[PDB]
């Protein structure tokens, strides 16, 4: 649970939201009524903002590697997790985010030949210290995979954390790894 100066749960009415580039304020059920959408982007600016923040101290990183303003600058996608019925029910929270987005990597194989790939990278990846290992990173993980339309196997990832190393162990059965020298980690089955 981490809060905000503002309405959270009728930013994002659903429990988790897609965002990319465009920054584009979800669509409310008719009424309603709503506040100006510069003003609703300006609210999902400070969020990502917030969440990158939040995920840079928890990975004892010196600067954010998810924001508003690599958001827009990037082709990113965000999916952010909020806390539906929390209780007391204020005025919303936000449990985690992944974010995802497809990079050129040069890849080594086994037999260790480079090869220029862009798969969808897990690139940042955050669920609230106070509700980590709930399993609402799976929560996140599944709904992505879902909308991205990837199998576990065809990722790679920035610099996986050791938590998440286990995670993806545990849930995907991601366990051998094929050495990169980019900081990147792919796993067997990336190259079938
Ligand atoms: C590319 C990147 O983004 S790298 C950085 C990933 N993000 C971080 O390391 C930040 C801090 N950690 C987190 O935000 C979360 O723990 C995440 C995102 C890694 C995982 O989300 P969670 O909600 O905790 O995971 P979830 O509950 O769904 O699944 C649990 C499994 O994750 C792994 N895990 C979670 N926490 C821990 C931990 N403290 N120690 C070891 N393994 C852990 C385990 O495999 C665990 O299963 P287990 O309890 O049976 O051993
Ligand atoms: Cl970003």
Do not use: W
């Not at 992505?144 to 995670?167: N, W, Y």
């Amino acid at each position: 649970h981490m809060e905000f100066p503002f309405d959270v749960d009728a930013l994002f009415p659903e429990r988790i939201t897609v965002l990319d580039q465009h920054l584009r304020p979800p669509a409310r059920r008719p009424g309603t009524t709503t506040p100006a959408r510069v003003d609703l982007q300006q609210q999902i600016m400070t969020i990502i903002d917030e969440l990158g923040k939040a995920s840079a101290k928890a990975q004892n990183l010196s600067a954010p590697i998810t924001s508003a303003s690599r958001m827009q600058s990037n082709r990113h996608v965000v999916y952010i997790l909020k806390d539906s019925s929390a209780r007391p029910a204020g005025k919303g929270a936000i449990i985690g985010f992944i974010k995802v987005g497809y990079k050129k990597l040069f890849v080594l194989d086994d037999r260790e030949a480079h090869n220029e790939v862009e798969p969808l990278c897990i690139l940042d990846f955050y669920i609230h210290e106070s509700v980590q290992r709930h399993g609402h990173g799976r929560e996140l993980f599944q709904y992505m995979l879902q909308k991205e339309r990837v199998e576990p196997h065809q990722l790679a990832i920035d610099r996986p954390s050791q938590k998440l190393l286990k995670f993806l162990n545990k849930h995907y059965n991601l366990e051998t790894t094929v050495p990169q020298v980019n900081n990147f980690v792919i796993f067997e089955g990336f190259f079938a």
